[PDB]
Amino acid sequence: MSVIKPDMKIKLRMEGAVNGHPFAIEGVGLGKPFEGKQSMDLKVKEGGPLPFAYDILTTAFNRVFTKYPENIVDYFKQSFPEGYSWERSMSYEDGGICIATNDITLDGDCYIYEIRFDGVNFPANGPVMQKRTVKWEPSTEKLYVRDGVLKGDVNMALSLEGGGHYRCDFKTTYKAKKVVQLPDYHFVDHHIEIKSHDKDYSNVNLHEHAEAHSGLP
Amino acid sequence: SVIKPDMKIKLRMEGAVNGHPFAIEGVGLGKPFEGKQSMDLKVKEGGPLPFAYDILTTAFNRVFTKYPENIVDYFKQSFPEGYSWERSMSYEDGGICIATNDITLDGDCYIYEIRFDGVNFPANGPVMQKRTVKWEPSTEKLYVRDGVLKGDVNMALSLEGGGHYRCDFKTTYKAKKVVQLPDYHFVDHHIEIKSHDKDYSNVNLHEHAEAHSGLP
Amino acid sequence: MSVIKPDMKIKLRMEGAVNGHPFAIEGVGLGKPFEGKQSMDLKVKEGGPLPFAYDILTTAFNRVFTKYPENIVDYFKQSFPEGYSWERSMSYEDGGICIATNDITLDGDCYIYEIRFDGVNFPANGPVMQKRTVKWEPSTEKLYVRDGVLKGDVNMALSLEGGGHYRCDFKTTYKAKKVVQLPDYHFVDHHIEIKSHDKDYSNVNLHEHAEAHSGLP
Amino acid sequence: MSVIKPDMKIKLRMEGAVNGHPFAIEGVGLGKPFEGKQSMDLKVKEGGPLPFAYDILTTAFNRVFTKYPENIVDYFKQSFPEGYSWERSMSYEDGGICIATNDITLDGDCYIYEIRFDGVNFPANGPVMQKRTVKWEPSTEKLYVRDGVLKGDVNMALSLEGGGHYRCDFKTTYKAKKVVQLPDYHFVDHHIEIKSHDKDYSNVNLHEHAEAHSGLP
Ligand SMILES: [K+]
Ligand SMILES: [K+]
Ligand SMILES: [K+]
Ligand SMILES: [K+]
């Protein structure tokens, strides 16, 4: 009581490949774990310029930054100081598919992410290889316990240039590194936004706002 | 001027699950602007039903959804001509249902013609074993595609003995006339069986639904 | 044991709906069970002229007509005279999805099918509603036992007018009406063909050739 | 002169992660490309003993070793000496999902593979993490052209210890590194087998036999 301060820092490195093309990105940021807000700056270190839509990475760049109510177990805050990991599949409607992992540790006031990201089967003319995405719409993730860990599923949509949406289904498994208390079925509303970026996206400023709830009464 | 603050509902569903035919009729009423509704359902054929009644309930109308001013209400616009929907329901254990509803309006009463079909439910699964408790509340994601409205929702049935059984809904809503097309939005749901008899020949069913646009 | 002839007959009625549009079709045919060949003539009785590619229905119009090698168990011929039923989902790459059931009985030398077929979510501009399909490619179905019944999965593809293919995944459950010996994992090669039809498909002549095998040695 | 001999060699390195646990494997082998047979020895170099069923990896360890008839275009042999790459998703019935990539080059008479393999969401209690798999059944892959490259889809099944099967759907994209003749829709029968292995699977002898065909008749 309590290793989680109302303001905390973040450092990350992501190593990855999309359609066989390796890349690496590093980031530093800060957030307010209790208001469920956070932001960070990201730099492409390898594989620049990135030949695919930068949006497909942004949800990989931590649910501790989630405003939780008193009446809902917070699975992620409990997990610390030791931390937790997640595994995620991201299945796009045109047969594109990404899978990512994050190992999350804590070093004093700073969370440290080790991220692996991989994607394949994106069509050369699809909205990802042509960089035709605008942003992720807001979302509501559904979280439920299975086999003693936490699952989260969310229907995601990328707004497209020239209108319409491009759909993706996320399936995440969250794994506390130690015994914590398990939440009941609940929801997390999200909104992730790229607030600014250069032309090749080599530098990105990224924000997220997330709040948990129990849905309709 | 066809949508009165209090409306009635009449429906018939004809269907089959794992090749077993059945039919259900229902009467109900709701408050379209409050996004609340309820109804009484009676199994007319194929009773007693050999499968979890819960797979049928979401088939038994987004007219009954509370829409804000700032969000276009596709469903209230479609009347008096009305609209139809098509829906696939994909269960994590390979069970799959598809349903259709053709919705018309007669005076103050909505009329549903529903077809429901399901296959490949495992005999030892929670559907055929009837081990479901209720649907969790949900948030549906609605977006336009090819001039019509799509709605996708991550659904989950609570199970006897704990845990959940997941289902992915994909719905297409089709107005039977030209209507204004909404921006990407959400509909929170909560559907509940309030009462039923032992073998579910009689069911009282409630839904509460509200539209919104997510996190500012 | 002997309730099957080297030549047998078929009668069927299918009732169905695609995208909410009801229809009905009847058919009569004959086949050579032990050779795995059959053909039939089909007539639209209701809902004509069908507004969707007829091809989506054709596999719905009996594995009794499969040549089975002596060394593979034949679940299908073995089930008669009590017969069997099947349930099938057919998932198309564009979100279109059909499910169908067949209850198969035997009356003397004639199999009788009671078929229900339903499909939804076919896009208005897609190859099914726009009737742009040419034929099913031949296929190899994979059959395996689960929970004391027989499963069959097959990767299907419709050739398209002006090139390319439109993919569909079939998952079938076959259920004998009496206890039968269960087969080992095996394959059925298929080739289904519309040999002739009239302009709007009110009348169709349909052939299938099917042989079981156990793959590369 | 043809860069493809009747007998050729193979060298590979795979780097990967399953459920967030990294590993690396190297292999050397040889095969007869015009006969569609090949074999190789594999050694775990990092991450061993592998904590998951080795079986999930084996298909990631080259369609060149496929016997093509003369009447079917051979996308793979044509692609050399410049070679080709593939991307593959492998979707398991219990929500486990792997994606892999292979970049294939040619050095003299030795193919060189650079392989990335990633898998997530395999349940702790599943047959992959519990190592309850026996072998892959033989299979028939379906190959078709799309967007000027070659697609291959295959229904796979792992035989399980003490009965039954565990199903996986493969979707592969093959990309020649230069312009080659595109084939028409066809099939490849496969049979992959671990012929021998030591106890924790640090050392594996792996064989594959593959033949192309056009289906019935
Ligand atoms: K863009
Ligand atoms: K129950
Ligand atoms: K056509
Ligand atoms: K084993």
Closest by Cβ to D140, choosing from C144, C159, C187? C187
Q: Is the torsion defined by CA of B63, B68, B69, B71 positive or negative?
A: negative
Closest CA to A135 of A118, A160, A153: A160
Nearest ligand (C-alpha, residue D55): 4
Instruction: Using the mean position of ligand 3's atoms as its centre, give its distance from the Cα of residue C160 in Å.
Output: 8
CA atoms of A78 and A187, how far apart (whole Å): 18
Residues of A at the B interface (Cβ-Cβ below 8 Å)?
137-140, 142, 144-146, 153-155, 157, 159, 164-165, 167, 169, 185, 187, 189-191, 209-211, 214-217
Closest CA to D202 of D59, D102, D98, D54: D54
Residue D152 domain boundaries: 1-217
Instruction: Using the mean position of ligand 1's atoms as its centre, give its distance from the Cα of residue B153 in Å.
Output: 27
C-beta atoms of B120 and C85 within 8 A: no
Cβ atoms D13, D34 nearer than 8 A: no
Chain A residues closer than 8 Å to B208 by CB: 216-217
Chain C residues closer than 8 Å to D190 by CB: 216
Question: Smallest CA–CA separation between A132 and chain D, in Å?
Answer: 18
C-beta atoms of B172 and C20 within 8 A: no
| Two structure tokens written together for A143 | 């979280």
Name the experiment that determined this structure.
X-ray
C-beta atoms of C87 and B120 within 8 A: yes
C-beta atoms of A17 and D95 within 8 A: no
| Two structure tokens written together for A105 | 């540790």
Which chain D residue lies closest to A20 (C-alpha atoms)? D101
CA atoms of C157 and A98, how far apart (whole Å): 25
Three-state secondary-structure class, residue D177: coil
Nearest ligand (C-alpha, residue D162): 4
CA atoms of C157 and C170, how far apart (whole Å): 10
For chain C, what's the residue count?
217
Q: How distant, in Å, are the alpha carbons of B28, C8, C44, D20 from that of C12?
A: 39, 14, 12, 53
Backbone angles phi, psi at A128, to 5 degrees: -90, -45
Sequence-ordered list of residues with C-beta below 8 angstroms from that of A78, at least 6 positions apart, any chain? A176, A180, A181
Chain C residues closer than 8 Å to D209 by CB: 216-217
Sequence-ordered list of residues with C-beta below 8 angstroms from that of D49, at least 6 positions apart, any chain? D200, D201, D202
Q: Is the torsion defined by CA of C19, C171, C100, C147 positive or negative?
A: negative
Cis peptide leading into residue C138 (ω within 30°): no
| D209 among annotated binding-site residues | yes
Sequence-ordered list of residues with C-beta below 8 angstroms from that of C117, at least 6 positions apart, any chain? C14, C15, C16, C17, C18, C57, C60, C98, C99, C100
CA atoms of A197 and A190, how far apart (whole Å): 21
- Which residue is associated with the tokens 């996004």? B35
A200, with CB counted inside 10 A (0-12, 13-18, 19+), is exposed
Mutate to test the interface with A, among B36, B154, B159 (most CBs of A within 10 A): B154
Instruction: Using the mean position of ligand 3's atoms as its centre, give its distance from the Cα of residue A208 in Å.
Output: 48
CA atoms of C210 and B130, how far apart (whole Å): 38
Chain A residues closer than 8 Å to D120 by CB: 87-89, 99-101, 173
Q: Tally the domains of chain B.
A: 1
| Two structure tokens written together for A135 | 């942003």
Please spell the DSSP secondary structure of A167-194, one letter per residue. EEEEEEEEEESS--PPP-SEEEEEEEEE
∠ CA(A41), CA(A130), CA(A61), 5° rounding? Answer: 25
CA atoms of B48 and B202, how far apart (whole Å): 11
D51, with CB counted inside 10 A (0-12, 13-18, 19+), is middle
Chain C residues closer than 8 Å to D217 by CB: 191, 209
C-beta atoms of D120 and A89 within 8 A: yes
C-beta atoms of C215 and D191 within 8 A: yes
Cis peptide leading into residue C2 (ω within 30°): no
- Which residue is associated with the tokens 């349940």? D123
Q: What share of chain C is helix, strand, coil (3-state, %, to 5)?
A: 5, 55, 40
Cβ atoms C190, C66 nearer than 8 A: no
Instruction: Using the mean position of ligand 2's atoms as its centre, give its distance from the Cα of residue B156 in Å.
Output: 14
Closest CA to C83 of C110, C61, C56: C110
Cβ atoms B58, B135 nearer than 8 A: yes
Cβ atoms D139, D168 nearer than 8 A: no
Backbone angles phi, psi at C98, to 5 degrees: -115, 150
Closest by Cβ to C20, choosing from B18, B100, B124? B100
CA atoms of D181 and D179, how far apart (whole Å): 7
Question: Smallest CA–CA separation between A120 and chain D, in Å?
Answer: 6
Chain C residues closer than 8 Å to B19 by CB: 85, 87, 101, 103, 116
C-beta atoms of B120 and C20 within 8 A: no
Q: Which chains touch D (3 or more CB pairs under 8 A)?
A: A, C
Sequence-ordered list of residues with C-beta below 8 angstroms from that of C136, at least 6 positions apart, any chain? C55, C58, C59, C156, C157, C158, C159, C192
CA atoms of C50 and C44, how far apart (whole Å): 8
CA atoms of D177 and D83, how far apart (whole Å): 6
C-beta atoms of C216 and D157 within 8 A: no
| C209 among annotated binding-site residues | yes
Three-state secondary-structure class, residue D57: helix
Three-state secondary-structure class, residue D60: helix
CATH number at A201 reads 2.40.155.10
Closest by Cβ to A87, choosing from D103, D121, D147? D121
Q: Parallel, antiparallel, or unpaired: how do β-strands A97-107 and A84-92 relate? A: antiparallel
Alpha helix ranges (H) inside C16-127:
55-58, 75-78
C-beta atoms of A216 and B188 within 8 A: yes
| Two structure tokens written together for B178 | 């030209």
Cβ atoms A112, A104 nearer than 8 A: yes
The conformational region for residue D38 under phi > 0 = left, psi -120 to 50 = alpha, else beta, is beta
- B92-127 b/e (C-beta count within 10 Å ≥ 16 → b): ebbbbbbbbbbbbbeeeebebebbbbbbbbbeebbb
C-beta atoms of B100 and C89 within 8 A: no
Cα D94 from chain centroid (whole Å): 21
| B196 among annotated binding-site residues | yes
Q: Is the torsion defined by CA of D177, D183, D187, D191 positive or negative?
A: negative
Chain A residues closer than 8 Å to D173 by CB: 120-121
D26, with CB counted inside 10 A (0-12, 13-18, 19+), is middle
C-beta atoms of A142 and B163 within 8 A: no
Q: How many CB atoms lie within 10 A of CB D83?
A: 20
Question: Smallest CA–CA separation between D2 and chain C, in Å?
Answer: 28
C-beta atoms of A140 and B166 within 8 A: no
Please name the helix (run of DSSP H) or strand (run of DSSP E) that holds residue A78, with its range, or none.
helix A75-78
Return the CA Rg of chain D: 17
Q: How distant, in Å, are the alpha carbons of B2, B171, B190 from that of B71?
A: 20, 19, 20
Cβ atoms C60, C170 nearer than 8 A: no
Chain D residues closer than 8 Å to A87 by CB: 19-20, 120-121
**From start to end of chain D, where are the E strands?**
8-18, 21-32, 37-46, 84-92, 97-107, 110-120, 133-136, 139-146, 149-160, 165-176, 186-197, 203-213
